[PDB]
Write a protein that binds this ligand. Structure first.
Ligand SMILES: [Ca+2]
Ligand SMILES: [Ca+2]
Ligand SMILES: [Ca+2]
Ligand SMILES: [Ca+2]
Length: 148
C-alpha cells in the first residue's frame, strides 16, 4: 500500500465517506448493509459479518479506513457479474442497437413458451422503462433484474 499516498487516500476517502454514516471512521452491517442493498445485494447478517471479518485486519470488528481499501479491491470483481447479465440483454435485443422495444422483447418472451399481447408486455415495459419511451435499454434492463 505504498502507492496509495495522500493522492490515493483522498480518492478512496470518498468511497469510505459515503459508507461511514455514523461519521467516525468505521463500517458495520448497519452501514455496509445500507449501501450494499442499494445496488441489489440485500446480504444477510451472516453475509455482512463474513465480509466485514474478511477485511477486518486491525482486530476490532468494524472495517477501518485502511482495511476498507482491501474490500474495494475484492468488491470490484464481485460486481463483475454485471457482464454475466449482459448476455441476456443481447438475446432480448433483436436488432442489436441498445434499446429493447416492446415488440422486440415481446417476441422473445413468446419463445419461452407462452402467448403474450401488447397489453401484457406493456405492463412489463412500465417496469424497467424509467424515462418512459416504451423501451428497455441496458440500464433499464439491469434495474429490472435487480428490482423486487
Ligand atoms: Ca461507521
Ligand atoms: Ca477493522
Ligand atoms: Ca432494440
Ligand atoms: Ca427506456
Amino acid at each position: 500500500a505504498d502507492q496509495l499516498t495522500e493522492e490515493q487516500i483522498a480518492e478512496f476517502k470518498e468511497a469510505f465517506s459515503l459508507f461511514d454514516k455514523d461519521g467516525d471512521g468505521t463500517i458495520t452491517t448497519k452501514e455496509l448493509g445500507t449501501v450494499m442493498r442499494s445496488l441489489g445485494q440485500n446480504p444477510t447478517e451472516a453475509e455482512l459479518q463474513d465480509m466485514i471479518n474478511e477485511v477486518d485486519a486491525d482486530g476490532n470488528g468494524t472495517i477501518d479506513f485502511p482495511e476498507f481499501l482491501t474490500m474495494m479491491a475484492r468488491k470490484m470483481k464481485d460486481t463483475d457479474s454485471e457482464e454475466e447479465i449482459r448476455e441476456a440483454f443481447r438475446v432480448f435485443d433483436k436488432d442489436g442497437n441498445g434499446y429493447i422495444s416492446a415488440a422486440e422483447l415481446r417476441h422473445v418472451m413468446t419463445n419461452l413458451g407462452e402467448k403474450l399481447t401488447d397489453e401484457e408486455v406493456d405492463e412489463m415495459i412500465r417496469e424497467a422503462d424509467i424515462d418512459g419511451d416504451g423501451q428497455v435499454n441496458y440500464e433499464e434492463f439491469v434495474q429490472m433484474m435487480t428490482a423486487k
